[PDB]
Design a protein around this ligand. Sequence first.
Ligand SMILES: Nc1ncnc2c1ncn2[C@@H]1O[C@H](COP(=O)(O)OP(=O)(O)OP(=O)(O)O)[C@@H](O)[C@H]1O
Ligand SMILES: Nc1ncnc2c1ncn2[C@@H]1O[C@H](COP(=O)(O)OP(=O)(O)OP(=O)(O)O)[C@@H](O)[C@H]1O
Ligand SMILES: [Mg+2]
Ligand SMILES: [Mg+2]
Ligand SMILES: [Mg+2]
Ligand SMILES: [Mg+2]
Lengths: 380, 382
Amino acid sequence: WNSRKVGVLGGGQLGRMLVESANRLNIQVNVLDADNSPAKQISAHDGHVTGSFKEREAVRQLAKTCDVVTAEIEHVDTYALEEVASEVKIEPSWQAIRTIQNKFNQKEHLRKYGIPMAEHRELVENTPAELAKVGEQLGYPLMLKSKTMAYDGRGNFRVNSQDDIPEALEALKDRPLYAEKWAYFKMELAVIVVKTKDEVLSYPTVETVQEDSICKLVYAPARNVSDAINQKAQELARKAVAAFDGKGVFGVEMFLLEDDSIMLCEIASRIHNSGHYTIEGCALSQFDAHLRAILDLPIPAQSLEIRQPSIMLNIIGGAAPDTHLQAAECALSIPNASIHLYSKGAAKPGRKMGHITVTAPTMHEAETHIQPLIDVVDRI
Amino acid sequence: MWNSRKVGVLGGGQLGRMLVESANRLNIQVNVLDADNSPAKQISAHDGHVTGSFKEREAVRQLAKTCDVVTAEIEHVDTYALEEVASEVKIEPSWQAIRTIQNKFNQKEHLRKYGIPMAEHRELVENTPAELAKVGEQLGYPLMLKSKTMAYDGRGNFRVNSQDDIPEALEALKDRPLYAEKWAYFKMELAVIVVKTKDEVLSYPTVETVQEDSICKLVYAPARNVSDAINQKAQELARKAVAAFDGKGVFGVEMFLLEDDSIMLCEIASRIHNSGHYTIEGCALSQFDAHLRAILDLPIPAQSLEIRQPSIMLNIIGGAAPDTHLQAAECALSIPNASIHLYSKGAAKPGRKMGHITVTAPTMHEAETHIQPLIDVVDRIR
Ligand SMILES: Nc1ncnc2c1ncn2[C@@H]1O[C@H](COP(=O)(O)OP(=O)(O)OP(=O)(O)O)[C@@H](O)[C@H]1O
Ligand SMILES: Nc1ncnc2c1ncn2[C@@H]1O[C@H](COP(=O)(O)OP(=O)(O)OP(=O)(O)O)[C@@H](O)[C@H]1O
Ligand SMILES: [Mg+2]
Ligand SMILES: [Mg+2]
Ligand SMILES: [Mg+2]
Ligand SMILES: [Mg+2]
């Protein structure tokens, strides 16, 4: 069962956690990324392919040596993937990844399936006049969005008023964009879905908190949220994921609106930051679940249940190249703190350097244990 | 710079591997001393590892020259090279400790003065039936004939039902230093994992262990059906045993619970032990996380070794077939809340510890129910 070889496009922390799981199962993983990547570092064998998963020919080498190829990002060359689909299984599917990696197309496909979402207008002209018109239809503020290559919200620009139109466009020059109606959410939610060969399952709904457009915190499960909203959100995520072909873990972002209704923010065709808490909080982490789904191995549902309330805090670079080691050093003394350093090295501000996951029998207790670290992070 | 230190591990097996697993999470470098491609090395792709044996003087010397601290994943190492190197590298736990622990007759003779309860025993100065018998005549039958040295998985012990048994005994444990212990009729076996640090002595809760063909099979944590009085008594015994040795690190203590509720020591392991594998999922800080911090003087918050939910651990022991462990692993895939750990040792040999499965649940009763089918399976295959 475990003699197959899994190829992973990307060798960052996501790829790494993934390799932690395969290692557990003695399943070989061949990472395609820079030599030395966080993920090649815990997997000492010769099967790895050095290069970019944006580069056609490497992806080609990866493929020809693997039984299944998967990705640890949604910005991979799905055309290069399309080429080898003859040679190797690809999961999830490259069409699904293709639709998904372009934020506008993902939304329009989803619309066919009736998924609650924020209204938007594709921007064909990229002229301040075109945008003014949208503004009139959608109102301010508006969230100007890049369709592709999007992450950490570096390709998004909040347009508060007709007057920011120029800064917005200068900000997001040379890209296809769409403008989306503003989501007045009271909380951001996320659900990790496991799409298998036969079913679509999900972990419980959690609460995500981004600072500076970057994920800073996750509370699992979501604080002050009725089991119903929880289910609803889950139920929604599963349905949105089902509109895709292929297997594996999908990260689903959502918005909790003031009336407690739910809208989809965006889907990620791969294991995702919101789910790192499953390492310590559930029987099978999303990494475990991903491997299993793409190789058709059983996935008991109770294994995706949350064992104890957990709170995950990302370690993000600050200006000083050690800060991440500062957060971690502090972490060493937080009770019930589980520390994950990414072995990326020296920090660049805003880079994801590691994460700390804290558990306790109750959320309150967990919040109490981690505050001091949260504090340290804020201050420094 | 706390995690910039380098850790040398004498031994690259499953235990060292799990140690590496912890070091990896803290991004701490570990230089493994063992054969190329050993389990621990496989998840550690750097060029610092040492190729050779933990029983080998110079290899041990070489490794030492390469790190800040040397620790071990096994008891059977050259404590004479470590003594040679003590002025060059910190070694934790102490080489003297491992030196004493590695010889079981010496370990127990050391503990006798610290007043630890244990079985009566007699060293065998000659491995002559003539000798074994007079011994037979001193502690009665049946008795456990045991090699003081290179012991594991009972691969060095023989139960001696009686005199007719003798010759077999000697032949099985031929050309080894031996000792003989009076039989211990326990009503159950228990173990406590202890951690010695620069300023404290911590411990995990007591668990119930179950051996089969003298190899550890399962672990129930905490121990089922043991009064509160018993766990304390157990915790104390263990901690008392540990205290008789110097060094920082994790130690495992195996005890016997007798019919009358008294506990006697079975053996103490100078390092991470099978009894604690459940800590990976049962606690915030695993025994492996604990060991690394202890030896590096890093904080170990106490609440981090408290158990989160009941758990049961089961070892995947090889059988006649060298792929059966995959069969157990494979059945595990379907057990609810079962976390599979496979060691990457290759084809199985009989009795080899191939990997382990850990199942947790809000209650032991539920953990047991989940696990049963897996047990049923492993047993079929025995
Ligand atoms: N219409 C909107 N209204 C309000 N807030 C929005 C809107 N779109 C985005 N946001 C805020 O922007 C954040 C980042 O948006 P998004 O997830 O769409 O960007 P990204 O670059 O895709 O991020 P990621 O790092 O997750 O790939 C959201 O998590 C939410 O906080
Ligand atoms: N006197 C004794 N009476 C009865 N059983 C005994 C006795 N000594 C050992 N055993 C049985 O043998 C089991 C394994 O023996 P022991 O730990 O001494 O050997 P070992 O080779 O050191 O094994 P390991 O290091 O793998 O634990 C004990 O757990 C116990 O159940
Ligand atoms: Mg995104
Ligand atoms: Mg997002
Ligand atoms: Mg032993
Ligand atoms: Mg033992």
